[PDB]
Amino acid sequence: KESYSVYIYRVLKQVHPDTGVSSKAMSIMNSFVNDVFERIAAEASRLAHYNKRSTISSREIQTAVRLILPGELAKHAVSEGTKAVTKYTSVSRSARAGLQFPVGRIHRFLKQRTTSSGRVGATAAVYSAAILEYLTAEVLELAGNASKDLKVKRITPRHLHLAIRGDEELDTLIKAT
Amino acid sequence: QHGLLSTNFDMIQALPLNVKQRVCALKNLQMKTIQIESDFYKRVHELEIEFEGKFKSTFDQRKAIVAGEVEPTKEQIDTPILEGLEGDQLAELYKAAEADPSAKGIKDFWLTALRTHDLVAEAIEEHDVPILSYLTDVTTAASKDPAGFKIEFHFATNPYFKNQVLTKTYLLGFDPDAEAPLQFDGPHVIRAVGDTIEWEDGKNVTKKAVKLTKTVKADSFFNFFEPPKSKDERDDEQAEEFLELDYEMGQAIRDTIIPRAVLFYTGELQSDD
Amino acid sequence: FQHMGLLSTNFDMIQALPLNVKQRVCALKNLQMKTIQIESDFYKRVHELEIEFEGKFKSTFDQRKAIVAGEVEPTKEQIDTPILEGLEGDQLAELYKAAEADPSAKGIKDFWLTALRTHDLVAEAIEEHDVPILSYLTDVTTAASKDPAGFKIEFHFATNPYFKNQVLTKTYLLGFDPDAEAPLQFDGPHVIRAVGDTIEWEDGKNVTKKAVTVKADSFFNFFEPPKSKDEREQAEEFLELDYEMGQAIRDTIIPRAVLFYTGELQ
């Protein structure tokens, strides 16, 4: 398990500047991000076996996303990933892609969790970072709206449960993983 | 450092000869500057050696706290476990789990510190984790003749290997490299020397067989102690980039993790890159 | 360093620790403050070494200045040094034969301008109207002091139509101790204050000013640095950026200037 807490917090402070998040909710968000990333990368490696030179680029990820993200979530994640790869191929790699999530850390988590001799390109890390950042963002807004609905300035695991149940595709994703 | 691929080649090539020769004189002068930098780096090496004695007390006391040989004082207990906590937060933290006398010391200190550094985390595989749990201390010392330093990992009695200390030693050149004098940017590694690990039966996670049946390298942190050979005894630039990676990991452990181990245990030192 | 403890990488592990073990960790935090104070003293000692070596570095730098200003001619040894590394006898011979000697060319035109503009960070601070002014730069020097602690960079300008100063000076006052309100974040000297220099601009020449008169983008804003806390968070980020540019020039560019001139450092 890696930790994304700082990136999760930065995304939160974009979409809900006034709103905080508890340790229990942060733990859950870290589980969410890691458990999704491990599915996406498990598909990228197996897809890269069918690639003579074990190469991984934004296509293996754009296909792992469709395999996993239900319906509308996939459409929006793929759109965000392409817009980010565009911003990157044109400061840090993540700022270059216009992202809060870590591009380089994820590039490295992509070599270690996938191919070895082949070549994982930087566009693949950019794409993966945008996918994770988008998913994190949706969950955080939904729960933050919910916590504001209860006149509270702090997302708890209860608000997380509410934001996940009141959206069919997020619900599916969580159960599936 | 870099042939013809120098950023300003076209300007240089277009320079009158008499100016090109002044630039050549500056290259000569840059070699002299580099020799002075070499001597400066030797002085810094001696400073690190001199300061080992000054650091020694805080490091031994850390070892003792971790091994449970000494108990915290009230001054230490009043030091916040994490900085940047609202007051109720620190108190709830201190109340989130009751004391447990069956727990000696700080289990898994060095393992957690090592795996929280991103570079060293890349070298730790799942099969290394229980071995590193037996790590009771990590130490470093520097020498002047021969010039370099060592890192020593102290292991409690354990079912994986019989060694009490695993040692990594780096031999450094502080003089400008003669193969590339202007490329000098500090001490460079001449040789890495590891330690023979006396594995118990069935425990050598660094070695695997494949089918003729040949023994090959498996991925393991403990390949740190079988470092790549150098031209001295050596692809040719693969064991050379491997050697740099091994030296960079050495430097991380010596310079960063050992002096700041608890901040890696907590995770209070992070990297975005 | 993460100042929000709830964002610590291993927070949940910490939170689950039995109290007696948490207290052992607290003792480790205390010992780490002691370690950091000793590290502070180490950095002070390194500073004294940097000062001590100035006499030896200054000689090589003075000779480089003399070469660039055309005050001395290359020696036979210096001419037999290749202009570029990684050059053969044949490529090298062609290079020397690609343009004939030119006695109207004194010294090395635009040395410091080219070296400064080849560094990516410092090149981001040089604007197009700065280039002809920096063309008049004959030397860049740095020196360190111990009390008050810090360093200065001095830009030496030949007589020029932009301003009257011969030397423009930038000075940094550095703290070498850990902040006691936040000791654990210490990782070396930190910048307290940057002090610049008043530039005596000729009429109509001040490229730091535009009429839209308001402040313009210019390398020479280096010499009117951001104020520090007492003389007023974004000004602390601007101040940090200013100190990093100082460090680039002092630590990297000045000791290896010709390698930036050639473009051999990337």
Automatic annotation (TrEMBL), chain C:
Principal localisation: cytoplasm
Subcellular location: Cytoplasm; Nucleus
Entry GO MF terms: cholesterol binding; chromatin binding; histone binding; metal ion binding; RNA polymerase II-specific DNA-binding transcription factor binding
GO biological process assignments: double-strand break repair via homologous recombination; nucleosome assembly
SUPFAM superfamilies the UniProt entry points to: NAP-like (SSF143113)
Gene Ontology CC annotations of this record: chromatin; cytoplasm; nucleus
Keyword Ribonucleoprotein annotated: no
Entry similarity comment: Belongs to the nucleosome assembly protein (NAP) family.
Name of the protein: Nucleosome assembly protein 1-like 1
Organism: Caenorhabditis elegans
Taxonomic lineage from the root: Eukaryota, Metazoa, Ecdysozoa, Nematoda, Chromadorea
